[PDB]
Write a protein that binds this ligand. Structure first.
Ligand code: CHL
Ligand code: CHL
Ligand code: CHL
Ligand code: CHL
Ligand code: CHL
Ligand code: CHL
Ligand code: CHL
Ligand code: CLA
Ligand code: CLA
Ligand SMILES: CC1=C[C@H](O)CC(C)(C)[C@H]1/C=C/C(C)=C/C=C/C(C)=C/C=C/C=C(C)/C=C/C=C(C)/C=C/C1=C(C)C[C@H](O)CC1(C)C
Lengths: 221, 240, 219, 217
């Protein structure tokens, strides 16, 4: 391990100067180690490995989820004729009479049957999550969570310092999204609107469109 | 146990006549070899090279070019510094093998497509142009592409395939590459079993090209497609 | 088969490329699915087998008792509103809570009597399950036998080690079906046999996707 | 799992005693010869020659009964999509139009049909006994040669189980055609036509409705 500012004992910590010393098993050689395991879920090194594919796959779905939830909603506000632009109201586009027209374009995908969508989702997602565990034509014996090869086509993970630097960027962009995708869930249950519709209202009057205007919403009654 | 009855072994190689001989430049190493080469098109055609002449305007006599050497033909060097003329010879047997196959693979992929498209839609392959110049359809379902969009998609995509096909330098591997293109690994091992697979492709290649040259000529006379010009023959044949 | 390192697993052909080393095949019900790594400690993995097996036994008792008041309802047995997720409110009916339909049966009105009786019964009975007592003490905390195997079935140790796998597989989908019954009552609001009657009336139109837009947040 | 004494038998886990001359060596050995037809080790070969030819001639047959009536339901105007009515198509003036298409085969002379079949099937079953330009001295049932172009029968290990899959699919198809002859005499309808009527109402459109069909007097 080089002097790379993110790995080793000089690494930054999740409370800054007030952290003191990390736990005795978080020694700073894995990405995003700010030393935050105060509840100590992962003291077993067999168990601590099991949360890291559990964290990284959650990151690699949430970063798709963060962009995926707003990008049809953003283009919907500029005249793209979606059925629904709001992410939590877009699943029910299969029940309308025109089918789920992709991009609001009737000459695209034009899905009709919700069973046919789910029938082919399981037959594909079973195979590729099956391939992620082992095997599969794109690589036989590789890493469980950095396979490379045919999953790094542009060849930008070859130098062992740069590749050890981009793993820190992947998990921090990931942990930004998982925290934010958690935010989409709560401010859709509470506010009931699309997430940029929440944003364009907070930019309208920031003193009165904050979250405290919804504080008395769940009063026991 | 066996018994030779009802047939004859003939002890031979099944040439394109019942009794002629094989031309010298054809040897039975290729799967399609039935000894059919009139007009000497794959004969080793040796050349002769003539030196350049004199332009040399500040001189007394600008003579002529004359003979230098009688070289022999060296086919199928497919060295990839050229990229627009890879083979060392136009008239080399290994290039025409590849030129027969790629003509074959487009033909039988088109002869079947000239019927299945008609058997559903009813539009013959001759008149497939105007009927989608107005609306892009496929199996009765509409498609969003203009015909200007179709050509740029066609030239860019099938360009790179025909560029990547011109990237291999081995004259046999340019014909039968395998690798990714043989996922079942049928002709990849068991070289005798692979050989009768190869004779099945060239026979389906030779039959395809004649059949597609069959469609077009009778579509020039009749103006009718693949199956529409079939029913016209069975029209009078049944009744008369 | 069913034991050793050649047992069937939870993904089949894909499963062999990631199976935990602390899961070996020495316990019944090993299909090698501990991807979250929760039972890597062999002491906690001793406890999670005990939590799994008890949960299964209340599920097998539970899942059978949720439908027997409804199958008898379609075979002409007079109940007062026998649907499992609202049969607890039958004690506030004016006739008490009669068992089948008959007043000369149990006829319970005061729930304070039947509650405080239960917690004293279940208090000592659950206490005796951990420490032991009048039905044997020095016995296995999961499979004591003897007083709970009267019929001699827990003999032939090549058969007893396979009835465990029938015990837990039958137990696991009962746990999976009570998690069924809970959600199909929260969303729909009717008994599961009434759901099973309505799915068979029209399986293409009447399924769970008809209730997909129920919980959209109107605000 | 399939050969030797630790093979499954026709009665399964409660099988007890099979016949003695069935050692778990040959395909389809479930020990079901309770009437004891083939105690002769020579004659038992002749039935294995004869079960399989019945098996192969019945697996290709099932796609001649199901398959034209199935294509007739999806928009192909056949002359007779029902399989036992298919022979009568040559006696109508439209003729035997293949796939209901007049510019295909269009058979007219019924005596000219089998007039050339006997010359072929005579020469082609006689090749199966001996000789033939395909395979000269080879196996009587599994020659390979150029009957197996793709080479799914290369190693001798995997070749045993493909022989098992040939005969279990095969015995299943022969079961359906002792079926197929009954359900046409009884109902007079196509086999999938009986399947389309059973899915509409199973408790009424079963065979007990036709239980009084052959009632005397
Ligand atoms: C990937 C996760 C996933 C999530 C979080 C959702 C969520 C949703 N879907 Mg959706 N779906 C998801 C995958 C899929 N859906 C569908 C097909 C549909 C249809 C047809 C419909 C929906 C609808 C809905 C919405 C119900 C309204 C609501 O919950 O109120 C607001 C409350 C929240 C948004 C909080 C929800 C958070 C969630 C409960 C916690 C997240 C953890 C999950 C438990 C993880 C689930 C993944 C599991 C299954 C492995 C909701 C946004 C309905 C809709 O469109 O609403 C109008 C609808 O009609 N989905 C398919 C194709 C089969 C999917 C493929 O996997
Ligand atoms: C053969 C077909 C095959 C298909 C369609 C997929 C599909 C997918 N894999 Mg998968 N995989 C497949 C084979 C295999 N995968 C994996 C191991 C993984 C891992 C570790 C991951 C994926 C992920 C993904 C997703 C994103 C791909 C990507 O990063 O593109 C970008 C690259 C070029 C555009 C995508 C759903 C990722 C994921 O699930 O994140 C949500 C992920 O982290 N796959 C292995 C083991 C070597 C395979 C073996 O053949
Ligand atoms: C490269 C292969 C190729 C060939 C052989 C043809 C051939 C044809 N196109 Mg076609 N096209 C081809 C590619 C493409 N076309 C089109 C778009 C069109 C349109 C819009 C039209 C045609 C038409 C025609 C026909 C014009 C001559 C005629 O009257 O037929 C008789 C002559 C022959 C059959 C000679 C064949 C020679 C040989 C013996 C075989 C002819 C069948 C026209 C037509 O006739 O439609 C009614 C028409 O309007 N083509 C596109 C754009 C997507 C192509 C992409 O590369
Ligand atoms: C070879 C294919 C094969 C595949 C793909 C699976 C897959 C599975 N097996 Mg296995 N098995 C397979 C072979 C075999 N299994 C078994 C025996 C078992 C057993 C005993 C068990 C499993 C279980 C499982 C599951 C465990 C993984 C998981 O938890 O998914 C998690 C991920 C998902 C479920 C993805 C979600 C998919 C779906 C599209 C979601 C839909 C989204 C919603 C519509 C919207 C979201 C709602 C919102 C609003 C909240 C999974 C479904 C376990 C199980 O049943 O758990 C329930 C289990 O107990 N298998 C045998 C016999 C040896 C097999 C034979 O080869
Ligand atoms: C342990 C239980 C078990 C039992 C009882 C059987 C029994 C049978 N197996 Mg076996 N199997 C069993 C386990 C297993 N079998 C097999 C695999 C096979 C195969 C592949 C085959 C059998 C077959 C047979 C049959 C052998 C004799 C026969 O043909 O009877 C036939 C006679 C009767 C069953 C009695 C009479 C028929 C009918 C029920 C009478 C009803 C009366 C009518 C309604 C009256 C009609 C009115 C008038 C007009 C006449 C019989 C049905 C053979 C078979 O399928 O034959 C058709 C067969 O091919 N078994 C496996 C997988 C390893 C098993 C696993 O344990
Ligand atoms: C070899 C198999 C074979 C069988 C079993 C049949 C039987 C049939 N043909 Mg067909 N044919 C067969 C091949 C051929 N036929 C024909 C030419 C015709 C014509 C022109 C006609 C038929 C018709 C019929 C049907 C008579 C209706 C009937 O039998 O009443 C119901 C009773 C049954 C279906 C019971 C059948 C069971 C069968 C008797 C027992 C099976 C063993 C056989 C004895 C074996 C066959 C011969 C052996 C020696 C090889 C029926 C599907 C007629 C038709 O379809 O009109 C409606 C008709 O007009 N066939 C040719 C060309 C020469 C064939 C080629 O070999
Ligand atoms: C020389 C020409 C010749 C032709 C055209 C046929 C064709 C046939 N043989 Mg025959 N055979 C021929 C010679 C020979 N056969 C056999 C031994 C057999 C056997 C054992 C069987 C056949 C079967 C068949 C029939 C099924 C098609 C098939 O096998 O699909 C395979 C090929 C491509 C898919 C068909 C009539 C089968 C049959 O009749 O059952 C329905 C069958 O079981 N033939 C031998 C001895 C080795 C031959 C000698 O050359
Ligand atoms: C975790 C990933 C994820 C998931 C599950 C979803 C889920 C969904 N998205 Mg979103 N999305 C995401 C990420 C995600 N999104 C991201 C990251 C982007 C940015 C690129 C988008 C951008 C986006 C748009 C713009 C739209 C969706 C839509 C949808 C919905 C249907 C998807 C669909 O029609 O697929 C079908 C899509 C494909 C199969 C791939 C694209 C294929 C196109 C059509 C080209 C066709 C290829 C070729 C030319 C044709 C084949 C040859 C043919 C001629 C034979 C569904 C709710 C649609 C919707 O209504 O939501 C509001 C919609 O219009 N998504
Ligand atoms: C050399 C290959 C070749 C070419 C150039 C074509 C070209 C065409 N086909 Mg054909 N086709 C082919 C092979 C080919 N086909 C084969 C091999 C099959 C069988 C799988 C078909 C089956 C077929 C059908 C069923 C239909 C076409 C149709 C079409 C037309 C537009 C569809 C299209 O190209 O979108 C690319 C496809 C995505 C166009 C004339 C459509 C049409 O209207 O034809 C008149 C149509 O409905 N084709
Ligand atoms: C083993 C044993 C044992 C014990 O011990 C004893 C005993 C009992 C004796 C034994 C048993 C036996 C048995 C079971 C038998 C059976 C068989 C069968 C059924 C067969 C079928 C068999 C069957 C068969 C061949 C069939 C075939 C068929 C065919 C070709 C068909 C054809 C066709 C078609 C396509 C259709 C069209 O429209 C026409 C035609 C032309 C008509």
């Amino acid at each position: 391990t080089p002097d790379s500012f993110w790995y080793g004992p000089e690494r930054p910590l999740f409370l800054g100067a007030f952290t003191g010393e990390p736990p005795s098993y978080l020694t700073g050689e894995f990405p995003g180690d700010y030393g935050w395991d105060t509840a100590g879920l992962s003291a077993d090194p067999e168990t601590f490995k099991r949360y890291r594919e559990l964290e990284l796959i959650h990151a690699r779905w949430a970063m798709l989820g963060a962009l995926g939830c707003i990008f049809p909603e953003l283009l919907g506000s500029y005249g793209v004729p979606f059925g629904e632009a709001v992410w939590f109201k877009a699943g029910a586009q299969i029940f309308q009479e025109g089918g789920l027209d992709y991009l609001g374009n009737p000459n695209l995908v034009h899905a009709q049957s919700i069973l046919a969508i789910l029938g082919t989702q399981v037959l594909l997602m079973g195979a590729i999550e099956g391939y992620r565990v082992n095997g599969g034509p794109l690589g036989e014996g590789l890493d469980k969570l950095y396979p490379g090869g045919s999953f790094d086509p542009l060849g930008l993970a070859d130098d062992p310092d740069t590749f050890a630097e981009l793993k820190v960027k992947e998990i921090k962009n990931g942990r930004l999204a998982m925290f934010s995708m958690f935010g989409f869930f709560v401010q859709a249950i509470v506010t009931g609107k699309g997430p940029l519709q929440n944003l364009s209202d907070h930019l309208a009057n920031p003193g009165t469109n904050n979250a405290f205007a919804y504080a008395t919403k769940f009063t026991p009654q | 146990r066996s018994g030779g009855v009802g047939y004859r072994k003939y002890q031979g190689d099944a040439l394109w006549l019942p009794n002629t001989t094989r031309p010298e430049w054809l040897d039975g190493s290729l799967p399609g070899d039935r000894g059919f080469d009139p007009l000497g098109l794959s004969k080793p055609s040796e050349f002769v090279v003539i030196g350049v002449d004199e332009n040399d305007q500040n001189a007394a006599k600008n003579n002529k070019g004359s003979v230098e050497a009688i070289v022999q033909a060296t086919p199928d060097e497919v060295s990839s510094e050229n990229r627009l003329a890879p083979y060392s010879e136009v008239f080399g047997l290994a290039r025409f093998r590849e030129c027969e196959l790629i003509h074959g693979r487009w033909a039988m992929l088109a002869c079947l497509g000239a019927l299945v498209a008609e058997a559903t839609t009813g539009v013959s392959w001759v008149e497939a142009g105007k009927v989608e110049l107005d609306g892009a359809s496929y199996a009765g379902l509409s498609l969003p592409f203009s015909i200007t969009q179709l050509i740029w998609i066609e030239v860019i995509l099938v360009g790179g395939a025909e560029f990547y096909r011109n990237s291999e330098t081995n004259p046999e591997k340019r014909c039968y590459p395998g690798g990714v293109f043989d996922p079942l690994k049928l002709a990849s091992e068991d070289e005798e079993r692979a050989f009768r697979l190869k004779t099945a492709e060239i026979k389906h290649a030779r039959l395809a090209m004649v059949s597609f040259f069959g469609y077009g000529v009778q579509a020039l006379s009749t103006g009718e497609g693949a199956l529409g010009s079939l029913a016209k023959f069975a029209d009078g044949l049944n009744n008369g | 088969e069913w034991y050793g390192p050649d047992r069937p697993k939870f993904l089949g052909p894909f499963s062999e490329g990631d199976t935990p080393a602390y899961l070996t095949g020495e316990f019944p019900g090993d299909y090698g699915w501990d991807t979250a790594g929760l039972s890597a400690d062999p002491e906690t993995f001793k406890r999670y087998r005990e939590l799994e097996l008890i949960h299964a036994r209340w599920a097998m008792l539970g899942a059978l008792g949720c439908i027997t008041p409804e199958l008898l309802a379609k075979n002409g047995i007079p109940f007062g509103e026998a649907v499992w997720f609202k049969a607890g409110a039958q004690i506030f009916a004016e006739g008490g809570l009669n068992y089948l339909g008959n007043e000369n049966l149990i006829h319970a009105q005061s729930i304070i009597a039947t509650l405080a009786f239960q917690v004293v019964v279940m208090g000592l009975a659950e206490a005796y399950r951990a420490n032991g007592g009048p039905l044997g003490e020095g016995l296995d905390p999961l499979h004591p036998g003897g007083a709970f195997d009267p019929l001699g079935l827990a003999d032939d140790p090549d058969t007893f080690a396979e009835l465990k796998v029938k015990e837990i597989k039958n137990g696991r989908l009962a746990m999976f079906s009570m998690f069924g019954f809970f959600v199909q009552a929260i969303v729909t609001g009717k008994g599961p046999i009434q759901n099973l009657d309505d799915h068979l009336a029209n399986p293409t139109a009447v399924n769970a996707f008809a209730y997909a837009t129920k919980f959209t947040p109107s605000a």
